[PDB]
From Swiss-Prot:
SUPFAM superfamilies with a match to the protein in the record: DHS-like NAD/FAD-binding domain
Broad class of enzyme this protein falls into: transferase
Keywords carried by this UniProt record: Cytoplasm, Metal-binding, Mitochondrion, NAD, Nucleus, Transferase, Transit peptide, Zinc
Chain sites annotated for binding Zn(2+): 130, 133, 171, 176
Example of a GO biological process term: peptidyl-lysine demalonylation
Notes concerning its domains: In contrast to class I sirtuins, class III sirtuins have only weak deacetylase activity. Difference in substrate specificity is probably due to a larger hydrophobic pocket with 2 residues (Tyr-66 and Arg-69) that bind to malonylated and succinylated substrates and define the specificity.
Annotated active site: 122 (proton acceptor)
Naturally occurring in which organism (per UniProt): Danio rerio (Zebrafish)
InterPro entries (UniProt xref): DHS-like_NAD/FAD-binding_dom, NAD-dep_sirtuin_deacylases, Sirtuin, Sirtuin_cat_small_dom_sf, Sirtuin_class_III, Ssirtuin_cat_dom
Chain residues that bind NAD(+): 22-41, 104-107, 213-215, 239-241, 257
Entry keyword NAD: yes
Cofactors demanded by this protein: Zn(2+)
Name of this protein: NAD-dependent protein deacylase sirtuin-5, mitochondrial
Length: 266
């Protein structure tokens, strides 16, 4: 149902809220996803490049792609949904109540909004992993390494940089000097289990669940939300996915997250 008053009553009692956030939230901030029919980067779409095969085969190109994506983030900002969440978390923490964010997104926009207890289940554009020793290190450097400066242009006729692998980002522990890769979960890679076991703990604790910028019935929101709802915990969706009447969940608020969510949480 679309009765807000009802949702708010639950919100008022809730002591542990879990907010699952999907692509619609980053979409509203203007982040290109490179899925859709016009979402190309040069000749390719995300599924061509976000794979270990692509990286093994052509690390320069994949790096050019991720560089580009890291750099466009300097002009996309958190929208009102990002903020409403972060300010909620803070407000409730003062009161001893908990709020967590389980996000599919890799743009660090929740972090930029001021959220703190965030689980990035698909990793982040702004972390690296050493192909060699596996160290996971935060990185917001621009450019991530000199070799990539001014690289990553999106128009198809752009010339490959074909950066020698020795000059792509390397792991700075000089005992190792291993080749870095973005700590994102590519197509065909599993999620990290340490994270899943945390998320599980969180979702078992939670007495209210919000699904924002996605639906509970779509992968990977489906891993989490049904689990909670089957224990009789309310679930509120905020999306403008236009989800057909017949399988929206408990409460639905159709519309842009930026519009719907902040009044929900005030
Ligand atoms: Na780990
Ligand atoms: Zn290393």
């Amino acid at each position: 149902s679309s009765d807000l008053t009802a949702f708010r009553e639950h919100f008022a009692k809730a002591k542990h809220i879990a907010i699952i956030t999907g692509a619609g939230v980053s979409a509203e901030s203007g982040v290109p996803t490179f899925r859709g029919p016009g979402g190309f980067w040069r000749k390719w779409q995300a599924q061509d490049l976000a794979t270990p095969e692509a990286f093994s085969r052509d690390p320069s190109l994949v790096w050019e792609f991720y560089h580009y994506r890291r750099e466009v983030m300097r002009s996309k900002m958190p929208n009102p949904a990002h903020l409403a969440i972060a300010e909620c978390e803070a407000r409730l923490g003062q009161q001893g109540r908990s709020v967590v964010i389980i996000t599919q997104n890799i743009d660090e926009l929740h972090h930029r909004a001021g959220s703190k207890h965030v689980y990035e289940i698909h990793g982040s554009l702004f972390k690296t992993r050493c192909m060699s020793c596996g160290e996971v290190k935060a990185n917001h450097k621009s450019p991530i390494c000199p070799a990539l400066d001014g690289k990553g242009a999106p128009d198809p006729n752009t010339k490959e940089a074909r950066i020698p692998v020795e000059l792509l980002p390397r792991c700075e522990r000089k005992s190792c000097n291993g080749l870095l890769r973005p700590h994102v979960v590519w197509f065909g890679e599993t999620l990290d289990s340490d994270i899943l076991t945390a998320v599980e703990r969180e979702l078992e604790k939670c007495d209210l669940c919000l699904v924002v910028g996605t639906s509970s019935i779509v992968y990977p929101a489906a891993m989490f939300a049904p689990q909670v709802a089957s224990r009789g915990v309310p679930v509120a969706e905020f999306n403008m996915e236009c989800t057909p009447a017949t399988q929206r969940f408990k409460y639905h608020f159709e519309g842009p997250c930026g519009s719907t969510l902040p009044p929900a949480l005030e």
